[PDB]
Design a protein around this nucleic acid. Structure first.
Ligand SMILES: Nc1ncnc2c1ncn2[C@@H]1O[C@H](COP(=O)(O)OP(=O)(O)OP(=O)(O)O)[C@@H](O)[C@H]1O
Ligand SMILES: [Mg+2]
Ligand SMILES: [Mg+2]
Ligand SMILES: [Mg+2]
Ligand SMILES: [Mg+2]
Ligand SMILES: [Mg+2]
Ligand SMILES: [Mg+2]
Lengths: 112, 116, 1066, 154
RNA sequence: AUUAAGAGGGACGGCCGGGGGCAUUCGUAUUGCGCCGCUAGAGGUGAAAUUCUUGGACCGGCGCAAGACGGACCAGAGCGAAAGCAUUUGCCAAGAAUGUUUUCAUUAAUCAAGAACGAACCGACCGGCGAUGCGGCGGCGUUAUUCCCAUGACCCGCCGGGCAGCUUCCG
């Protein structure tokens, strides 16, 4: 629910910005040609678009799930290539993917 | 539907007991042993004696409206044998001959776990 | 430490003793006052011998304080100065209680002015009455005494007393009661047996002087009163030898008076006075039960043990050590008196005025106190001795007898003519006994204890007629309902064959009728008409009405039963049958059906592991229970894209429907995402699947939302939430910059744990509690209604008020668990007004789960970290070291406002119920002032669905679009749509930093706006603080103030249509 | 528990597993772990539950014996006690039996113990009550869903 | 004096075991007792006979008490100097092996005497192959997963010290 608000406005050329600074008027929001919507009748309208589309929801849920999984898969595929394989200066990175169990890097384990 | 009962058939080598109670087994309907029908101690566990015992109980259940029975076959158990006696078969067979409906059969012979 | 606990106990005793005792300087001037009184009394003029009938010698301005109903007497009167003046009572004994200090003075009658036959036909009582009258005339003119008055000594209307008080300053410290007493051995003790006579029937009632007839009835109460004056000095002498020597005995005696004072068991006629326990402790010293080296606390520990275990109405005890063959037997006193005590002189019952019901109430109070003393816990001293126990606050229902003149007619129906003759003309005290005995037998199964109010001792000034028995006061009965036995609506008698059935037919009369039952027995039975449980709670009202009419000729109009008058506050506009628990049961059964449907649903990738309800309805704490609804089609719009309805612009706002939240847990698995936002995607998909399967297998209207699913079943709407076990753990993952991944609590993490884990537990825990205590639901709903009616609903959570309501039923240590909604509500106000929340946390021992060792540990931790805790802390076994239910709860300011309101609302509500006339308006404590608020906004009744829930019934209602005919519904009604709550959220969002908004969620027609003084002062230009503020040049500098005139017109624009008018003051 | 005119109204009293099914699971080349707990419900009912489980041979396993060490057995046993305890004292009698009919407790135990040692044939074999609360008529009423008849006086 | 023995002693690390001691607890069976239902017999034999029964035996149900015992899972597996050791949980002390780039530095072996405990073909004859129990090292892959509790189950190779088999070599 909006309250008191701030605004960023972009014009095509800087002279328009100067015209906005030099502008002086009452700036009526609601007029007969373009009424601006409020009141009880508005909350009915806000109840109208509050109706969700089950098809749209499923597509976005599928799309977000479709996008999520390769990133997990790509990290796993990258990790499996990087497991072992000491780099230059001969550093070997300790991972959970080896056969020797290792101490987790967690505060709870450190205190134990 | 069928009015059900529980029939207890204790089958010892010495004697045969047929006993019918309700579903909870607390109220007794009829109980006849092998000794009631044959007037001889040799034949109390004989199959013929058990058949007479089953027939008397089966007709008794008819006048009470009992039509189907659950069966609990039991041996002497304990340290002694765990085999049903000779009277078990004939009394079981005679119950089906009289027209009594047969439900589930189960062996409730007391089986010890620790030897004495 | 046990030594520290004893140290805490001993200091508590000492500080209590000092405040209830009297100072040495006050003793001295009281000794000075009595010396002046003794100097004054000894110089009185004498009068010559006159016939006792002739009373013309007394001047105008003084009246005889006896009413002298039979005016014919057979004696003569002479006045002489008192022979001996003796100060008696507890003043010289050293046991005086601070609120009332009284000094008793005995006046030894001269022998030469009394006759041998003065003990008959009230001659002694008459001569004593006029002796006081002559003294009162000669003492009133004296300027020493500020006030002089007449009263009754020892609670006897036939024994008046004289009151003297000092003038000017020191007026209230002490009062002196003047008690004339006969010579020591003037009368014969053998002439004053309970079985002997001293009032002849011919003089009392007959016109003939020597009418022959039946033997004269014994007059035990008359004999006790005459002997009572003769033994005045003997009590003081015995107590000086035994009690004065040993200290600590006085401490126990002084402590006993406070205990009797708090429970209202000492004052009134026939009350268990402190004089009695002083004789009781003397009797205990005679035995081996109490020894002289005892301390004050152990004496009260000892004395109440005797009261709780000894029933003195059947087994009397004697203080007489001597055992002579020619000594009166205890059997005779039992036939004459209900309570039988004895003195060294056997003839003195010393307990002739206390009733069996009064003694039973003492035994009941003694038993309750013993449990507290046996248990070891903190504040037991506070609960035992400083907690008042009013009769209205100690009993579930109260009953009033408005006209006491009608009780005289009750004496006529029953047979109390010998008893009315014995006690003079006091018909109130005569019929008090049998009537309570009649009722306790008729209500044996439905009651635990029956109590009756005692008439206060009157005080009237000289030159006024003494008060009559009719205007002595008002009689009130207290009922302690027994929880089991209220469920039955029948009182079962014996079978018709055996002859005790005829006895049953006598007690119940025409209402006794024959019945047969499925067990096969024919039985006499009486059936009442009680459909609802609240009506079953008023079954004793039907019982008491019928029996008094049949057995006392006391009409139903003379009985005012105060039972459940507050039930209208949690009911419909006109529906007094039930208080709503019946609707609560119907909703609960529907939830069980829905749980069974979910427990068995097929096609889910993961099956259901647990179903829990998290709504006030399911724990019986909903103030207005819901009902199944059927929306009206022509009242609405319909989308036609889903089966959901839309509110219409021209029609009024539709009826309010609130879904019930249900928490569902699925099977654990390892295929869940380990990402915070990805779990949100899976949960929303589960909402879609659950709605799809539900509508296919059972044909239910289900709407899928990203956070919940709304299901319509049997006219009810349920909100199903699916939760994941490890989601709170995932929210606690915080990778630190240094390179370590830790687990820390988060506000989002804390909130999810509350809604899915803590909330279901309390809902299940309180649901089980209602099973043991059916009255829990009524008290809790009335508690919420009062708080929300005081416009303080905001800030007080629903669960917090349930916990304090549950605290009454789990820890009513002074009292018994409540059985009526009204008695719990009174205890609710008392707890809020008197609890010290600053230094004490409230414990709610749900199904035990906490021992005393843990409790003392938690209280130790409570004081160590009081600053980090909220101002109010409630301790439960599941929610321990903190109160998550009040962390976002009410602030300290509105906390003190409620305490002031609760302390204010309690007295007149107590007075309203205790008034013999019907309460003028039960809704007085439910209306808010509407005076302190700066701006008041009125809302249209057209757009408020919750308008029938108002405290003041409007009697006119709008059409809300519902179908009266029950049945299924194919379209969804609008869920949770009410403009007053939408309007408040907009107000508190835009103008929260500037003002505070107060509203009543149940029928609120006005919103209270209170400005914040700190925000309205001028401030420098801060960009974040420019919300609703304008710039001034009054001081020549740019500063900030809220734009009041623009705010007021925002109140009208926001909420157009629903808002009617806005008024601003000051 | 109560009789209402030719209608005996009953309540749950206990649960047991049949003899033949019990004998069939107990095999020879595996280890069996058993535990028992005493738990009180929310509505005052006190229960004793017995649980039994058997180790599982893996598909690719070549070793003929599938035996669990002593500490693994105790760790398995400790988890079994905690799960049965937590699944009863939080709920009431009505909820527990609804869980017990499809044996949701046994499946939950089986999944949790896969880390220690794989298990199968996990069941709750017996349920007993040790203490019952005071009989209240209304509590029976939701489970199963009088004044008498008038006789004329002579 | 040096080294630090495929000589010995001690510490340290994580595990392991029907090893021992003290409490605690559960499970059927059997026996006895209490109450309810039913009515002439029940038991035992090769056939009987001792016994129990109308004051109700036996059988069916509910509950209580007592003394033993700890199946199936249980294996030529494990532990202990031997005799011996099997429900659960808590507590006390001890020990084997393995791991060790720790410490001391010959402190050792076998033994009459003496002490503790004690049911009721042949020979130190080098090796090999399979399994099996515990500890450790390395590994392609499956299978679960860790708030606490916990980091495993399976397969393959290898190193020790054990319980045992099938075989060879030497005197
Ligand atoms: N039932 C009774 N029988 C005999 N005497 C009585 C009875 N009740 C009161 N009295 C007498 O009343 C006199 C006045 O003292 P009372 O018993 O009223 O106590 P008190 O002085 O008010 O003491 P406290 O302050 O301790 O209550 C006493 O001397 C006592 O003997
Ligand atoms: Mg007094
Ligand atoms: Mg070495
Ligand atoms: Mg070690
Ligand atoms: Mg160990
Ligand atoms: Mg061990
Ligand atoms: Mg290994």
């Amino acid at each position: 629910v909006p309250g008191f608000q701030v605004a960023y406005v972009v014009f095509q050329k800087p002279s328009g910005v100067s015209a906005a600074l030099a502008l002086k008027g009452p700036l009526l929001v609601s007029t007969e040609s373009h009424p601006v919507k409020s009141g009880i009748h508005k909350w009915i309208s806000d109840y109208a678009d509050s109706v969700p589309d089950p098809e749209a929801l499923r597509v976005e849920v599928d799309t977000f799930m479709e996008a999520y999984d390769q990133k997990i898969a790509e990290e796993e595929a990258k990790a499996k290539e990087e497991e072992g394989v000491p780099d230059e200066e001969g550093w070997v990175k300790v991972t959970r993917r080896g056969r020797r169990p290792v101490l987790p890097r967690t505060e709870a384990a450190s205190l134990r | 539907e069928n009015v059900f009962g529980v029939c207890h058939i204790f089958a010892s080598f010495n004697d045969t007991f047929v006993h019918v109670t309700d579903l909870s087994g607390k109220e007794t309907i009829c109980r006849v042993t092998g000794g009631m029908k044959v007037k001889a101690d040799r034949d109390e566990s004989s199959p013929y004696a058990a058949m007479l015992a089953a027939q008397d109980v089966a007709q008794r259940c008819k006048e009470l409206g009992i039509t189907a029975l659950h069966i609990k076959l039991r041996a002497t158990g304990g340290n002694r044998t765990k085999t049903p006696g000779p009277g078990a078969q004939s009394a079981l067979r005679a119950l089906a001959r009289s027209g009594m409906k047969i439900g589930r059969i189960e062996d409730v012979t007391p089986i010890p776990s620790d030897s004495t | 430490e046990i030594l520290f606990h004893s140290s805490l106990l001993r200091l508590q005793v000492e500080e209590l003793l000092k405040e209830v005792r009297l100072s040495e300087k006050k003793k001295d001037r009281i000794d000075a006052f009595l010396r002046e009184v003794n100097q004054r009394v000894v110089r009185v003029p004498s009068v010559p011998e006159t016939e006792l009938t002739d009373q013309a010698w007394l001047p105008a301005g003084v009246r005889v304080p006896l009413h002298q109903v039979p005016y014919a007497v057979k004696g003569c009167f002479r006045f002489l100065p008192p022979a001996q003046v003796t100060v008696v009572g507890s003043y010289l004994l050293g046991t005086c209680i601070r609120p009332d200090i009284n000094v008793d003075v005995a006046l030894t009658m001269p022998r030469e002015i009394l006759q041998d036959k003065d003990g008959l036909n009230q001659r002694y009582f008459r001569k004593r009455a006029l002796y006081l009258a002559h003294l009162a005339h000669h003492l009133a003119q004296d300027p020493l005494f500020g006030s002089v008055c007449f009263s009754y000594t020892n609670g006897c209307h036939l024994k008046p007393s004289l009151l003297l008080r000092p003038r000017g300053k020191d007026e209230r410290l002490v009062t002196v009661r003047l008690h004339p007493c006969p010579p020591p051995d003037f009368f014969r003790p053998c002439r004053l047996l309970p079985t002997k006579n001293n009032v002849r029937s011919a003089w009392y009632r007959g016109q003939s002087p020597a009418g022959d007839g039946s033997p004269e009835p014994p007059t035990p109460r008359y004999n006790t009163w005459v002997l009572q004056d003769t033994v005045l000095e003997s009590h003081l002498q015995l107590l000086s030898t035994i009690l004065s020597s040993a200290q600590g005995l006085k401490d126990g005696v002084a402590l006993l008076k406070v205990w009797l004072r708090q429970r209202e068991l000492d004052k009134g006629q026939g009350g268990f006075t402190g004089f009695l326990v002083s004789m009781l402790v003397v009797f205990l010293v005679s035995t081996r039960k109490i020894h002289t080296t005892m301390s004050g606390y152990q004496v009260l520990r000892s004395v109440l043990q005797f009261l709780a275990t000894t029933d003195l109405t059947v087994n009397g005890i004697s203080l007489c050590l001597s055992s002579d063959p020619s000594l009166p037997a205890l059997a005779d006193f039992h036939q004459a008196f209900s309570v039988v005590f004895l003195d060294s002189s056997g003839h003195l019952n010393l307990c002739a005025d206390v009733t069996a019901s009064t003694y039973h109430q003492v035994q009941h109070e003694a038993r309750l106190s013993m449990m507290l003393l046996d248990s070891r816990a903190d504040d037991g001293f506070h609960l035992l001795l400083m907690t008042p126990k009013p009769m209205i606050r100690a009993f579930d229902h109260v009953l009033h007898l408005r006209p006491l003149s009608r009780l005289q007619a009750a004496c006529h129906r029953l047979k109390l003519w010998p008893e009315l003759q014995d006690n003079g003309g006091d018909y109130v005290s005569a019929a008090l006994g049998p009537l309570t005995t009649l009722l306790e037998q008729g209500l044996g199964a439905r009651l635990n204890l029956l109590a009756h109010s005692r008439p206060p001792v009157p005080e009237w000034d000289i030159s006024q007629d003494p008060p009559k028995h009719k205007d002595s006061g008002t009689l009130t009965l207290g009922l302690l309902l027994r929880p089991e036995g209220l469920t039955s609506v029948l009182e079962l008698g014996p079978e018709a064959d055996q002859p005790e059935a005829a006895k049953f037919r006598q007690f119940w009369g025409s209402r006794s009728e024959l019945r047969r039952f499925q067990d096969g027995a024919i039985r006499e039975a009486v059936v009442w008409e009680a459909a609802s449980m609240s009506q079953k709670r008023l079954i004793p009202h039907q019982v008491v009405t019928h029996l008094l009419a049949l057995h006392a000729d006391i009409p139903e109009t003379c009985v005012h039963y105060v039972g459940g008058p507050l039930d209208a506050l949690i009911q419909g506009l006109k529906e007094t049958s039930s208080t709503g628990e019946e609707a609560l049961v119907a909703a609960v059964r529907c939830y069980d059906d829905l749980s069974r449907l979910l427990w068995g649903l097929e096609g889910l990738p993961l099956t259901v592991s647990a179903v829990q309800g998290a709504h006030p309805v399911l724990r019986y704490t909903e103030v207005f229970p819901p009902t199944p609804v059927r929306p009206a089609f022509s009242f609405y719009e319909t989308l036609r894209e889903r089966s959901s309805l839309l509110p219409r612009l021209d029609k009024p706002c539709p009826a309010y429907v609130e879904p019930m939240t249900v928490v569902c847990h699925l099977e654990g698995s390892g295929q869940w995402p380990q990402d915070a936002e990805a779990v949100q995607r899976v949960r929303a998909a589960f909402q879609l699947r659950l709605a799809e399967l539900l509508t296919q297998q059972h044909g239910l209207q289900c709407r899928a939302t990203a956070t919940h699913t709304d299901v319509l079943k049997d006219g009810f709407v349920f909100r199903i939430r699916v939760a994941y076990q490890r989601e709170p753990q995932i929210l606690k993952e915080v990778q630190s910059p240094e390179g370590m991944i830790s687990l820390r609590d988060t506000a989002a993490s804390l909130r999810l744990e509350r809604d899915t884990r803590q909330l279901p537990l309390l809902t299940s825990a309180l649901h089980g509690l209602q099973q043991q205590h059916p009255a829990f639901s009524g008290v809790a709903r009335l508690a919420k209604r009062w708080v929300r009616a005081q416009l303080l609903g905001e800030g007080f959570a629903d669960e917090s008020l349930d916990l304090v309501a549950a605290a009454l039923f789990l820890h009513p240590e002074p009292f018994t668990p409540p059985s009526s909604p009204q008695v719990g509500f009174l205890r609710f106000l008392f707890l809020v007004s008197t609890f010290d929340w600053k230094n004490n946390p409230l414990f709610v021992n749900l199904n035990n789960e906490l021992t005393v060792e843990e409790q003392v540990e938690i209280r130790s931790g409570f004081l160590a970290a009081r600053a980090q805790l909220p101002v109010m802390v409630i301790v439960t076994p599941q929610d321990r070291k903190n109160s998550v239910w009040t962390q976002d709860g009410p602030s300290a300011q509105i906390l003190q406002q409620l305490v002031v309101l609760a302390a204010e609302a309690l007295p007149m509500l107590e007075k309203q119920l205790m008034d013999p006339r019907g309460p003028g308006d039960i809704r007085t404590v439910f209306r808010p002032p509407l005076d302190i608020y700066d701006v008041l906004i009125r809302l249209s009744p057209r757009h408020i669905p919750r308008h029938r829930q108002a405290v003041d019934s409007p009697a006119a209602s709008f059409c809300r679009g519902l179908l009266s005919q029950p049945g299924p519904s194919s379209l969804m009604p609008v869920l949770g749509y009410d403009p007053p709550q939408l309007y408040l959220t907009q107000l508190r969002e835009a103008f929260g930093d500037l003002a505070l908004f107060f509203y009543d969620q149940h029928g609120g027609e006005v919103i209270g706006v209170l400005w914040k003084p700190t925000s309205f002062q001028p401030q420098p230009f801060k960009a974040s603080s420019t919300k609703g503020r304008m710039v001034m040049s009054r001081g020549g500098e740019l500063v900030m103030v809220p734009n009041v005139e623009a705010i007021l017109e925002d109140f009208a624009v926001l909420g157009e249509g629903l808002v009617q008018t806005v008024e601003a003051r000051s | 528990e109560d009789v209402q005119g030719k209608n005996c109204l009953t309540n749950f009293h206990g649960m047991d597993l049949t003899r033949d099914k019990m004998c069939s699971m107990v095999k020879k080349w595996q280890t069996m772990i058993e535990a028992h707990v005493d738990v009180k419900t929310t509505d005052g009912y006190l229960l004793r539950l017995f649980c039994v489980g058997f180790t599982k041979k893996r598909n690719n396993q070549i070793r003929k014996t599938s035996y669990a060490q002593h500490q693994q057995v105790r760790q398995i046993r400790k988890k079994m006690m905690e799960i049965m305890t937590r699944e009863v004292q939080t709920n009431d009698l009505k909820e527990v039996v609804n869980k017990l009919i499809p044996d949701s407790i046994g499946k939950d135990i089986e999944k949790a113990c896969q880390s220690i040692y794989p298990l199968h044939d996990v069941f709750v074999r017996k349920v007993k009550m040790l203490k019952k609360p005071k009989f209240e008529l209304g509590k029976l009423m939701e489970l199963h869903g009088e004044t008498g008849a008038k006789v004329e006086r002579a």
